Amino acid sequence: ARVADTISSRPTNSESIPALTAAETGHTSQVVPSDTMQTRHVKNYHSRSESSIENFLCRSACVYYATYTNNSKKGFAEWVINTRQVAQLRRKLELFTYLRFDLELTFVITSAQQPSTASSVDAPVQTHQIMYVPPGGPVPTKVKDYAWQTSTNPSVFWTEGNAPPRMSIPFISIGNAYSCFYDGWTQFSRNGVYGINTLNNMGTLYMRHVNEAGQGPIKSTVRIYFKPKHVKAWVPRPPRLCQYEKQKNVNFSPIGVTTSRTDIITT
Amino acid sequence: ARVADTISSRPTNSESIPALTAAETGHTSQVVPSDTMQTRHVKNYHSRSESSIENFLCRSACVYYATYTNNSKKGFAEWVINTRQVAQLRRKLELFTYLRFDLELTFVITSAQQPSTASSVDAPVQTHQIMYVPPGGPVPTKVKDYAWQTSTNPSVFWTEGNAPPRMSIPFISIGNAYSCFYDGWTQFSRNGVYGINTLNNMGTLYMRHVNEAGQGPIKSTVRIYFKPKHVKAWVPRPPRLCQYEKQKNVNFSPIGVTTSRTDIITT
Amino acid sequence: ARVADTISSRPTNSESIPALTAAETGHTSQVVPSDTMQTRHVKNYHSRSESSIENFLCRSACVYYATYTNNSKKGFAEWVINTRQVAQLRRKLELFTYLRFDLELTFVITSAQQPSTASSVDAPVQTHQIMYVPPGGPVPTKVKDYAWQTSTNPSVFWTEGNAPPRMSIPFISIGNAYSCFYDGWTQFSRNGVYGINTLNNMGTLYMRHVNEAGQGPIKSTVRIYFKPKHVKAWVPRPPRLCQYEKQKNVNFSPIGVTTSRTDIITT
Amino acid sequence: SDRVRSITLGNSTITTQECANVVVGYGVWPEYLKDNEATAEDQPTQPDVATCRFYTLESVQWMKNSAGWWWKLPDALSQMGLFGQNMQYHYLGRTGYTIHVQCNASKFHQGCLLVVCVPEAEMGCSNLNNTPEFSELSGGDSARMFTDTQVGESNAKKVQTAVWNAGMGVGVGNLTIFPHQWINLRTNNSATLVMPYINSVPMDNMFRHNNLTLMIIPFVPLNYSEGSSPYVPITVTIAPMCAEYNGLRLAS
Amino acid sequence: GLPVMTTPGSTQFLTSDDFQSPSAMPQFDVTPEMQIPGRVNNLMEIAEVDSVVPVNNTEDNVSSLKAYQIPVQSNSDNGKQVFGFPLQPGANNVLNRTLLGEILNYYTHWSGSIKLTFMFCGSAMATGKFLLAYSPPGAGVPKNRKDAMLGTHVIWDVGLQSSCVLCVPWISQTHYRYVVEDEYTAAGYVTCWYQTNIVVPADVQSSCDILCFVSACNDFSVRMLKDTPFIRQDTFY
Amino acid sequence: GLPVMTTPGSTQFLTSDDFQSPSAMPQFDVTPEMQIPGRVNNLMEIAEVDSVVPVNNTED
Amino acid sequence: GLPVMTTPGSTQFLTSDDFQSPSAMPQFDVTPEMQIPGRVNNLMEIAEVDSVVPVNNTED
Amino acid sequence: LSITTPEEMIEKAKGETAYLPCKFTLSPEDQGPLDIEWLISPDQVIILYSGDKIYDDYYPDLKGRVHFTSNDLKSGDASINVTNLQLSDIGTYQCKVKKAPGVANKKIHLVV
Amino acid sequence: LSITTPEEMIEKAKGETAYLPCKFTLSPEDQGPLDIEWLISPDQVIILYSGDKIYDDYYPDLKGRVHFTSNDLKSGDASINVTNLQLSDIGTYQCKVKKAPGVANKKIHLVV
Amino acid sequence: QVSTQKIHYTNINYYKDAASNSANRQDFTQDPGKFTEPVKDIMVKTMPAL
Amino acid sequence: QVSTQKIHYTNINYYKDAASNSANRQDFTQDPGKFTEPVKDIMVKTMPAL
Amino acid sequence: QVSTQKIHYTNINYYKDAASNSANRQDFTQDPGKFTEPVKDIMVKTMPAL
């Protein structure tokens, strides 16, 4: 996928003017630098490979991290899956209006000891369980419960000191593409919240320890990493300028177009 | 395995009535929506893949978990293999009357330290032994015994900090299919217990530590996970409505058909 | 790639003199030992394989090592990537003027406990994150920050007790070859620093822990190892004699040509 | 020549003496729903003469201190004849528009408009935690107008009408990536766009979801000397192309 | 029992890896695709769209629509300057927040040429001529019209057509250029000068305005994807 | 000694994996199958049976 | 689940190894090469150049 | 879970009956048990709804003066009717709904 | 980050105004916030520049006698103008600039 | 050995049992006629049932 | 199965899904004509626009 | 794919980049004539130089 080359030119003087045009018709001009000056025939060997979509989006980024204490009641972390909470990834998604991708979830789980009181503490390697619940399934309330094990929801079991776990999720949606924006309400009487869609629900993630409280509390921390693959994008969109403020809506505070300079001719 | 499409129709007026029928003959009607209205020719691209049997049953689920203390006499766990004890898996099995499958047993073993008294405790990595006894073999009584090692029963040895162990068990039965229900006694005089069959006995599982009590008691916990494969089901059955109460029989307490509403026209 | 052999000779007496020449023309003589004496026909089986460029340069060497304390504020290590800081590798690079290579970065990370005060300390396995920032990207300031995770810069996550991590970096430069030396300033008014080029900038490396301060401070230490491959060198250069003193410039102190002997005939 | 066009549809006809070329969507023309893409199980209805004609919205006065206007596109045509009545009794429906906006001044006025058609334009509220209501977001055939000043915090549910952020928190200079044209009183008089059906589902309800937005923003403001005509109106005309519906029900 | 040996680089998590992965829900059948209009296939189909360049900042017009207009008035003396800025499309604060500049602030290296579409949004009876000069670096900025006409320039006349695309060429020693502000690979300056005045008839306003676009050519290219400096964060929403 | 590198996602237990497994009792010969009437092959052969709809709840 | 056995010599870092490695920036396109004069191909093209021998040291 | 307007100002007169609305919708992941609170900060609970039974004797100044409105609380109604408004009812009211895994607030500022 | 001349000797006379230059360029990796110090060892800070605002009341002997020179400090200017030189101004001055990930020094020896 | 997925993929059997293979997941056949119409005399849609 | 890189390389699909494959990274096609010239009457460079 | 060593050996490229391959170590070519005799008129060994 090489770029176009450039062909040489001669000093012309004629009626065919390539430089004068009219931008009224919404037609961005397609001129070459060989039309306004004299160029040489340059063999051009650059590549437009890294500007494609599958090289721009298929990179891993953190989406969320929650902590949970082993020595607690309701010590476990729930998180509804959505891209809207981080900001370095969200701005990359709103360049396009309709996206379509599968997903490669990856978790990086670390642990830390809390200031316990017991004497000569020692614990073996821990075990974590990351349960994935599709939208509608029964969810657990406390950690010591039978709804964690006796279920056919796809969970993953991981012990420390190994490679990080990774599962893959295909395109789970009802429409034909994920809608990054939805102008219009969700109730037919046109009351209530504004931009809430039911087209990009993927489910929740329930994470907890498997061991029991031996002698000292352990506070863990788990990051979640996306990786969109096979991505097809549609209908591009100008990039977000003002700062984000909420995860659901698009509200903002006004600010100027760019930072200023001293005078219109100051370089 | 695509679904059937739908063909367009014209406004008819004739003697062939496709809508009127008689449900007395036990024949569920086979009408198409192209017979009661006017439809368009819709290319239909859905799939009935995930509704098959080998995608509905071949998912792992917990069956049992037992704990056993290292610093004890008779500290070890015995468990006769049967599906009847959990409830999220049992209801999936009683949809069909006769099943036939092999099995992929998988264990997730975790450990925890008990509140010991000794000073500066430290233990190396532990070792667990999961012995599988076919129905009839000699079983051990105490943990320090020679019947654990000197036997040809297929056991598995596992140390912590690695991948979970997994063995596979083929279709071990005397009949031609596992009987989920058995209406009729097991003794020819028709006395005694009611629904007890000797057609789905698979054996017991004996689990214990291999190390010795160094300085501090360790209480472990092991979950067991089924995975039926190559499954063939026969003679479907309506799903269980009332709550389970026992593992052997099918007894229950009565409850209504569904939750009620206020009035027959209330939407 | 064998070396040339040697052919036998006879005692000559003629006008063709192969030994007398003139070194004024800058032409190093191409004589054979078969021209000044009598030799035998020696089958020669040596090899010039290990003297090639891809066997002289493709060997790993340490470039830098920094330490960082877990229990600190701004406890993390930044390092702009450049070859100029070690001396055993730098002298091997300045034999040639223009180099061109990719790179195989490899890190060896070790840890050590600091003299903490808390009682019965125990920590699980640690996690390190090595973030690679191309020249221009936003860099983090404190360790607890959201710019570490929510970014598309290629980082690597590593836990202890495994094989050392390794990533590969292709030829990232604007010119056609890395310039080991740049005689001439970088500003068009010819003021300021002397030998500073913007042709071999590769970016920085940010390294930090992922866990939190449980009970005792841990001071880690990470070495970085290069490995140039696919190397093509141009325009050789005499080797550096005087000691290095700075990483940017080439300044030095004068010293003699070699160590002396007692008298011109002393063997 | 190359300056005159005459687009007709149904029983109406829009003619222009001075206008530039027409810009059509993202390169496609609005056609009917093919049988591979459909998902509804019944047969659609196609009026095709009763809807495909040029409805005319209200007009707005271009003052010197003007800011901008916007319309939500399958909502301004809710009361316009047989399109507004087939939109209520049905449940689904896809459309393709042919937007046309016209504003004439003499050879002595100066100014420049920007006519853009934004798909899925979510707007921002005044307060950061609330959402704008329906009555303050669009109007039946009446243009809602921007301002040149940031809306204060004392309002509960009002749209942020700062024109340099275009309501959506985005830079207004980058708005030309959408299909667009320029009205410039020096050389141009009328702008015209053809917009195909752009949605993530093959058909959609029309009362809950406004899937287009026609924005008009004056970059170079109107200016003249004393003695010229001071009242310059703008008037937009929209015509749906190749519409169809499904799912009869009661009125609502 | 095939004998293997594990190379260094195992049991790691590289954030740009290309590996297969086991699925979570097997035999899933996705919903079929649709011919949605406007499919983007490459991010070099976005830099070839024009966007208005806010070339009139001056600390008072930044929070307004006045930042896009260049005031052009009927001057009394001849040979004055209209605007001017250096050409650093990721480093200057005029070509920063445009549509081209928010693509280059995801990459590190760029190449190719740049188009600069102008447009005279003035009256119909007012004419004039302009000189659109681009001076390569090495010297300072030009200061007279006599110094700026030595570079590369077109002479623009306004008539029926009201645009002129100065296409600056690619004159650089290196095959690429940085996007951050560097001194080694600077790209000169672009100025614009009055050729003649803006004449005007009676009862017409004088101060006509000019807009200015920017876009990329057909041979634009980028490299070395990085993360943007324009969006910060301190909490989860 | 073939050189390998272990990808992330190893030494884990996914509850919906498709992997082979070593058997416990090798060379086992199962009992042969039988033509039992009423073989279900798909769960969409159950939704095509009618069932009475309890449409008159009303709490009594 | 192919059965493997890990030979001794695994999980080590030899400083003269020859192994492949995953790239960090995929699909990178390098700048094209140039015919720079004076390409050295072997370090035995340096020992065949003369150099003056400092044979008169004598401490002064 | 999401409330229609997470803050507003309500202006009423003394002796009247206030109507503090709290409506919501239900995202498909929300499958747990319901929970509805109400607060005041002139952080004291004034009413509860958990386990399908109402508990409403919590604030001594508002004893027997506040009630729920609808009979269909699991459909998106959580409004309360404050009868017999007095001068000392100035404060921000907080409608906390928590159906797992969702949670939302609504700070109602009431000034008479 | 790099300063033009990291040490020199400056010789001035009493009553004059010293001009201690400190210029730099910017490598492409430097993207953090700016920081500029000045020291004296006749290790006391005499002026600061951090967070775009100047703080300059630090040395009691040089109170209100030292100022920055340029208005464009983020372009490579860090020179200061020492007004009203006295005999007790003997010492090495240290221009510490720190834009992350770069750091540089400049030890200016001033003898009158 | 090599077949299509939901492009191709390669599957090799390693162990020498039958209960050691992976799950099939591709037994796509159905026949609802033994549940919907389990009658003796055949029944047409268009004609009346009695 | 075997194709060129940026010499050749060998890629085998292992799992029997479609969402389990690696990223393509080699879908090199572009068509900027649907963004630059989205007009009805065609436009030549050399001739005047009106 | 298969070549000789210093008997044969088998080398397969796995990743789909170019900077991911192993080192070549077998680029055996040399040409010392551009350093020893960089002159214009050619020079014979046997004849005198001037």
Chain G residue numbers with beta carbons less than 8 Å from the beta carbon of J12 are 2
K39 in D contact zone (CB under 8 Å) = yes
Give domain limits for chain A.
1-267
Helix (H) / strand (E) element for B91: namely: helix B90-93
- For D10: left if phi > 0, alpha if psi spans -120 to 50, otherwise beta; the answer is left
Element (H, E) at C221: strand C218-226
> D22: Cβ–Cβ under 8 A, 6 or more apart, which residues?
D5, D7, D192, D193, D194, K39, K40, K41
**N residues, chain B:** 267
Secondary structure of residue B55 in the 3-state scheme: helix
Angle among Cα D90, D92, D96 to the nearest 5 degrees reads 115
Pairing of the two strands E2-6 and F2-4 = parallel
**Sign of the CA dihedral running B198, B199, B200, B204:** positive
Chain breaks in chain E (C to N over 2.5 A) after: none
Q: Which of D119, B44, D92 is nearest to A177 (CA)?
A: D119
How many angstroms separate the first and last alpha carbons of chain J? 53
CA distance H29 to A136: 5
Q: What does the alpha-carbon distance between residue C24 and residue G50 come to, in Å, rounded to a whole number? A: 12
Is D38 within 8 Å of B8 when comparing Cβ atoms? no
Pairing of strands I107-111, I7-11: parallel
CB A112 within 8 A of CB C212: yes
d(CA H88, CA A55): 63
Q: What share of chain F is helix, strand, coil (3-state, %, to 5)?
A: 5, 15, 80
Mutate to test the interface with E, among K11, K13, K17 (most CBs of E within 10 A): K17
Q: What is the DSSP letter of A219?
A: E
Quote the CA–CA distance of C124 and A113 in Å, as a whole number: 8
Two structure tokens written together for B211: 């190390």
CB A221 within 8 A of CB A154: no
Q: Give the integer Cα–Cα distance in Å for I72 and H106.
A: 49
Neighbour order of strands in the sheet with C155-159: C77-80, C204-209, C127-133, C155-159, E13-14
State whether residue I80 is helix, strand or coil: strand
State the Rg of chain D over Cα. 19
Alpha-helical regions (H) of chain D:
73-76, 82-89
CATH topology of domain D5-246: Jelly Rolls (2.60.120)
State whether L36 and G49 contact (CB < 8 Å): yes
What is the C-alpha to C-alpha distance for residues D41 and E137, in angstroms, rounded to an integer? 67
Q: Phi first, then psi: what are they for I68, rounded to 5°?
A: -70, 160
**How far apart, in Å, are the Cα atoms of C48 and each of C135, C232, C234, G44, L27?**
40, 18, 19, 8, 11
| D176–chain K Cβ distance below 8 A for any pair | no
> Alpha-carbon distance E56 to A261, whole Å?
9
φ/ψ (deg, to 5) at B23: -85, 10
Q: What's the Cα-to-Cα distance from A93 to each of A87, A204, D168, E235, rounded to whole Å?
A: 10, 21, 16, 19
Please choose, from the candidates A171, A169, A180, the residue with its C-alpha nearest in 3D space to the C-alpha of residue A101. Answer: A171
Chain J: nearest CA to K49, how far in angstroms? 49
DSSP 8-state symbol, J22 = P
Q: Mention every residue, 6+ apart, whose C-beta is less than 8 A from residue F56.
A: B264
* Burial class for I64, CB neighbours closer than 10 Å (0-12, 13-18, 19+): exposed
D220 with D112: CB under 8 angstroms? Answer: yes
CA distance A167 to A149: 19
Count CA within 13 A, CB hemisphere, residue B161: 12
**A100: chain K residues, CB-CB within 8 Å:** none
Domain boundaries, chain L: 1-50
Which residue in C249, C231, C247 sits closest to C64, CA to CA?
C247
Give the bridge partners for D55, in sequence order: D238
**Cβ contact (<8 Å) for A211 and B110?**
yes
Interchain CB distance below 8 Å, A20 and K23? no
Through-space distance between the first and last CA atoms of chain L, rounded to whole angstroms: 53
Give all strands of the β-sheet with H80-82 in edge-to-edge order.
Answer: H18-20, H80-82, H66-68
Tell which residue, C233, F35, A239, F47, has the closest CA to residue G38: C233
Residues of chain D contacting H4 with CB distance shorter than 8 Å: 131
All residues at 6 or more sequence positions from E116 whose CB lies less than 8 Å from its CB, including other chains: E132, E165, E166, E167, E168, E190, E212, E213, E214
Residue with tokens 């109400």: H38
Check A159 against F14: CB less than 8 A apart: no
- What is the least distance, in Å, from the CA of K19 to any CA of chain L? 19
Closest K-chain CA to G30: K6
Other CB atoms closer than 10 Å to residue B88's CB: what's the count?
Answer: 16
d(CA C97, CA A138): 68
d(CA B64, CA D76): 63
Contact (Cβ atoms closer than 8 angstroms) between residue B169 and residue B102: yes
Kind of pairing between the strands at I7-11 and I35-38: unpaired
Q: E-assigned strands of C121-195?
A: 127-133, 155-159, 166-169, 178-179
Q: What span, in angstroms and rounded, lies between the C-alpha atoms of A158 and B110?
A: 11
Nearest-CA distance from E20 to chain B in Å? 20
Nearest of B168, B155, G20, F54 to residue K5 by alpha carbon: G20
Given a contact cutoff of 8 angstroms between Cβ atoms, the answer to whether D162 and D150 are in contact is yes
Give the separation between CA I49 and CA A191, rounded to whole angstroms: 53
Closest CA to A225 of A60, A59, A56, A55: A60
How many helical (H) and strand (E) elements, i.e. helices and strands, does chain L have? Answer: 1, 2
CB proximity list for A174: less than 8 A, separation 6 or greater:
A198, A199, E31
Q: Looking at the complex, report in whole angstroms how far the Cα of residue B138 sits from the nearest Cα belonging to chain J.
A: 26
Tokens of G52: 């003056």
AA letter at H11: E
Can you read off the two tokens belonging to residue D200?
């993530």
Beta partners for residue A80, in sequence order: A204
Closest CA to H30 of A155, A80, A67: A80
* E34 near G CB under 8 A: no
The phi-psi region of residue K27 (left if phi > 0; otherwise alpha if psi is between -120 and 50; otherwise beta) is beta
Q: Return all residues near C8 (Cβ < 8 A) that are at least 6 apart.
A: C34, C38, C39, C40, C41
Check CB contact under 8 Å for I28 and E180. yes
3-state class percentages of chain E: helix first, strand second, coil last, to nearest 5: 5, 30, 65
Answer whether the bond into residue C33 is a cis peptide, omega within 30°. no
Cα–Cα distance list, B26 to B22, B29, C186, D17, J39 (Å): 9, 9, 93, 74, 8
**Quick one: CA dihedral F4, F7, F10, F15, positive or negative?**
negative
Q: Classify residue F44 by its DSSP letter.
A: G
Q: Which residues contact E124 (CB under 8 A, 6 or more apart)?
A: D107, D108, D110, D185, D186, D187
Q: Do G11 and C162 form a contact (C-beta atoms < 8 A)?
A: yes
Tell me, what amino acid is at E169? P
Structure tokens at E54: 């806010």
Secondary structure element (H or E) that encloses residue K33, with its range: helix K33-36
Task: Give the count of beta carbons closer than 10 Å to the beta carbon of residue A224.
Answer: 20
Cβ–Cβ gap I28/E182 under 8 Å: yes
3-state DSSP assignment of residue I75? helix
Single-letter residue type at B135:
P
Contact between C163 and E11 under an 8 Å Cβ cutoff? The reply is yes
CA A125 to CA C124: how far, in whole Å?
8
Give dist(CA A86, CA A64) in Å, integer: 7
Beta-bridged to residue E134, according to DSSP, are E152, E190
Q: Which residue of A has its CA nearest to C161?
A: A161
Chain K: closest CA distance from residue E140 (Å): 35
Contact F20, J20 (CB under 8 A): yes
- Chain B residues near residue E27 by CB distance under 8 angstroms: 49-50, 52, 55
| B24 CB-near residues (< 8 Å, 6+ apart) | none
Kindly list the residues from chain G whose CB atom is less than 8 angstroms away from the CB atom of residue A46.
29
Facing residue for C60 by CB, picked from G15, G23, G30: G15
Residues G16, C100: C-beta atoms closer than 8 Å: no
Cβ contacts of D135 within 8 Å, gap of 6 or more: none
The dihedrals phi and psi of E66, each to the nearest 5 degrees, come to -75, -10
Q: Name the residue among G18, G27, G48 with its Cβ closest to that of L36.
A: G48
Distance from CA of J36 to the nearest CA of F (A): 6
Q: Measured between alpha carbons, how far is B179 from D169 in angstroms, rounded to an integer?
A: 65
- Token pair 């003496």 is at which residue? D17
Give the torsion sign (CA, A218, A219, A224, A225): negative
Strands A155-159 and D55-61: unpaired
**Domain boundaries of chain I, sorted by first residue:** 1-112
- Those residues whose C-beta lies under 8 Å from the C-beta of residue E56, and which sit 6 or more positions away, are A264, E66, E67, E68, E69, E70, E71, E83
Cβ–Cβ under 8 Å, residues H104 and H36: no
What is the C-alpha to C-alpha distance for residues C242 and C252, in angstroms, rounded to an integer? 7
- The residues near D30 (Cβ < 8 Å, ≥ 6 apart) are D95, D96, D194, D195, D196, D197, D241, D242
Chain centroid to Cα B197, Å, comes to: 18
The answer to whether A215 and A116 have CB atoms below 8 angstroms apart is yes
Query: Would you say D146 and D164 are in contact if contact means Cβ atoms under 8 Å apart?
Result: no
